[PDB]
């Protein structure tokens, strides 16, 4: 199937005292495999998936070195943005960064990303072609001029198309027993009488991987969105995901309603009835 590698970075300034809080997390698809927390004791890039532990001391020293360089860059960045925005030293601010690559079913480069947000809002992003920038405002435009003159996009493109894809491919191999396995949702239906005229049917999807899923309700073979509730896909905590879709129905008419489940681990979509 298709795969992605993603790194998420959050830096939060702490004006009263000391350097910002810095958290970095690495993912292959929906699986977290590495972490760095500036508040943790080790001060090392740490494994969070057993298949990354196969990597030796060279890997860990290299990743630790780069993650600390990433941290100091974000520290300088928070100071630079406060100046660009003419903000005081009194308030706490957040810089967020995400970068990575998508690969198709051929495991070859499909897409690349390198973007930032300042205080929860879009700052600067590398465009899909990996050649130009989306600068949200005049502060982000100052970054865009600096990076254009320094040919930053060319350097990012080379990592995103080359390096990123090569390491994702390696991770996929080392973690093949879990990373290349799809866990189809375990589905069931529950019924709850609310009054003697109304009932709730709840269609559950559990223990599935990847997180991506579609649950739809049908009434007499026709799509129904009215009188339906669909919770956000949520982590189970064991690496799998959960989701439910409920429909409010007239008591005694339960049979008209069917739940439809689409997932990567399912060759053909599955149907559930009460």
């Amino acid at each position: 199937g298709s795969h992605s590698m993603r790194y998420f970075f959050t830096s939060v300034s702490r004006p009263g005292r000391g350097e910002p809080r810095f958290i970095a997390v690495g993912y292959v698809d929906d699986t977290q495999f590495v972490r760095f927390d500036s508040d943790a004791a080790s001060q090392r890039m740490e494994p969070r998936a057993p298949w990354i532990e196969q990597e030796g001391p060279e890997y860990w020293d290299g990743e630790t070195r780069k993650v600390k360089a990433h941290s100091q860059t974000h520290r300088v960045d928070l100071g630079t943005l406060r100046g660009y925005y003419n903000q005081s030293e009194a308030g706490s601010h957040t810089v967020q960064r995400m970068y990575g690559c998508d690969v198709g079913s051929d495991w070859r480069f499909l897409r690349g990303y390198h973007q930032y947000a300042y205080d929860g809002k879009d700052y600067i992003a590398l465009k899909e072609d990996l050649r130009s920038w989306t600068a949200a405002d005049m502060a982000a435009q100052t970054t865009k001029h600096k990076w254009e003159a320094a040919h930053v996009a060319e350097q990012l493109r080379a990592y995103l198309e080359g390096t990123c894809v090569e390491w994702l491919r390696r991770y996929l191999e080392n973690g093949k027993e879990t990373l290349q396995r799809t866990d189809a949702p375990k589905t069931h239906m529950t019924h709850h009488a609310v009054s003697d005229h109304e009932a709730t049917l709840r269609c559950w999807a559990l223990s599935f991987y990847p997180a991506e899923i579609t649950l739809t309700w049908q009434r007499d073979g026709e799509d129904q969105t009215q009188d339906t509730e669909l919770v956000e896909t949520r982590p189970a905590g064991d690496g799998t995901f959960q989701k439910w879709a409920a429909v409010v129905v007239p008591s005694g008419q339960e049979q008209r309603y069917t739940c439809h489940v689409q997932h990567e681990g399912l060759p053909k979509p599955l149907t559930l009835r009460w």
Binding site: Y7, G26, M45, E63, K66, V67, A69, H70, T73, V76, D77, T80, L81, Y84, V95, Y99, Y116, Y123, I124, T143, K146, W147, A150, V152, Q155, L156, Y159, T163, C164, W167
Partner: peptide
């Protein structure tokens, strides 16, 4: 595998 280079805003 993290990017070896970083670029300042």
């Amino acid at each position: 595998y993290l990017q070896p280079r970083t670029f300042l805003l």
